[PDB]
Design a protein around this ligand. Structure first.
Ligand code: UDP
Ligand code: MN
Length: 394
């Protein structure tokens, strides 16, 4: 082609001369913009946090994910680094087309152990690239990034700095499905590490995780290892009710077409720009227990003689707060919750969403609290008239 001789189009020639399958990027007329104009973020508290993009040999996914990353408000392209698990040519070509920094890594070990070793190399490299950074954003190559991803991190990053009980901040709510998530200004505390767009504290990585990172022979998933008690240690992460990332990768290490249609396709994705988070400082450890007690003292107790698995369980309402109590006789008795999550059509393969035996979600746009009795500390608010709901698997 004869595109106008500028730096952006010279970058375009070298790419379009080498690879195929990207459509309007390579057309003569109608060239797709390969530079973006996201909106500015006034007073950006995240402006000096590096962003680590983890990638393998999935060049089409990476190009899709980078287009939404470069479109988010308040993004800093200079802070982005793409870490590729190997020396594949096409992924490096895609990084070059957008003009970002790329780092290649020779693969170590096999299967999930090799994903684990790549993560460890990338996290250690990020904190070597910026010796003064205190956090780092970790992003997978198969995620769409919400347009307010950095606005969300900018307003909440100060919680990691002030609350030592916090493990991380994540963009992903495991129980935020299209029919059970509603409020993009709302945040929770959860007893797990969700990943899928998360913030890592440098002191946590350099002083705790890196010295005991699993060696290459162990066929362990890095994220399941980080959820083990010996790593998390009772700490919690901050998540929003409406997720700020979306997992679109169908071809992956543990991913197939069926598992995606069943547990990811219906995940809710925030599209409202520049949301102001509501009362952020209440997510600190002791202030949050004040908030949960306030929520439980305004919630209407539901009729527990009715079927929990059907819509009739709640009055025909919008905007109310209802509470339900389920049987949980030890800190690990999740039998009823798992059956409840299955019939609610949310995540039910391993337990997530819990905070001291409490689950928070939405049902027909009412806030819906679930309390485990007798194990939860909040069991003290169950009236005598309620017999906790119990359901066992067939
Ligand atoms: O051989 C590999 C396979 C995976 N990945 C990275 O590990 C993450 C997990 O990817 P994948 O979606 O394939 O795992 P899944 O979620 O499907 O189980 C991705 O960001 C990949 O870039 C990698 O670096 N090398
Ligand atoms: Mn994936």
């Amino acid at each position: 082609c004869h595109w106008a001789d500028t730096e952006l189009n010279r970058r375009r020639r070298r790419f379009c001369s080498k690879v195929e399958g990207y459509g309007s990027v390579c057309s003569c007329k109608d060239p797709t913009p390969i530079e973006f104009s996201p909106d500015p973020l006034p007073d950006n508290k995240v402006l000096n946090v590096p962003v680590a993009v983890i990638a393998g040999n999935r060049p089409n996914y990476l190009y899709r994910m980078l287009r939404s990353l470069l479109s988010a408000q308040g993004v800093s392209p200079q802070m982005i680094t793409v870490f590729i698990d190997g020396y594949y040519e096409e992924p490096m070509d895609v990084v070059a087309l957008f003009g970002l920094r790329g780092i290649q890594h020779t693969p170590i070990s096999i299967k999930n152990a090799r994903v684990s070793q790549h993560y460890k190399a990338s996290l250690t490299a990020t904190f070597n690239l910026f010796p003064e950074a205190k956090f780092a954003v970790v992003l997978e190559e198969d995620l769409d990034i919400a347009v307010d991803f950095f606005s969300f991190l900018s307003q909440s990053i100060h919680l990691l700095e002030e609350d030592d009980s916090l493990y991380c901040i994540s963009a992903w709510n495991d129980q935020g499905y299209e029919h059970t998530a509603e409020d993009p200004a709302l945040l929770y505390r959860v007893e797990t590490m969700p990943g899928l767009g998360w913030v890592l504290r440098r002191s946590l990585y350099k002083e705790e995780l890196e010295p005991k990172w699993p060696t290459p022979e162990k066929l362990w998933d890095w994220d399941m290892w980080m959820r083990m008690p010996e790593q998390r240690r009772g700490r919690e992460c901050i998540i929003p009710d409406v997720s700020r990332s979306y997992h679109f990768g169908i071809v992956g290490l543990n991913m197939n077409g069926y598992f995606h249609e069943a547990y990811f396709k219906k995940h809710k994705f925030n599209t409202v720009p520049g949301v102001q988070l509501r009362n952020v400082d209440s997510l600190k450890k002791e202030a949050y227990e004040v908030e949960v007690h306030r929520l439980l003292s305004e919630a209407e107790v539901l009729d527990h003689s009715k079927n929990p698995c059907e819509d009739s369980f709640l009055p025909d309402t919008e905007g109310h707060t209802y509470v339900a109590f389920i049987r949980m006789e030890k800190d690990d008795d999740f039998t009823t919750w798992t059956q409840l999550a299955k019939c609610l059509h949310i995540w039910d393969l391993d337990v997530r969403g819990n905070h001291r035996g409490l689950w928070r979600l939405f049902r027909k746009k009412n806030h819906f609290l679930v309390v485990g009795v007798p194990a939860s500390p909040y069991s003290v608010k169950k009236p005598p008239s309620v017999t906790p709901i119990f359901l066992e698997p067939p």
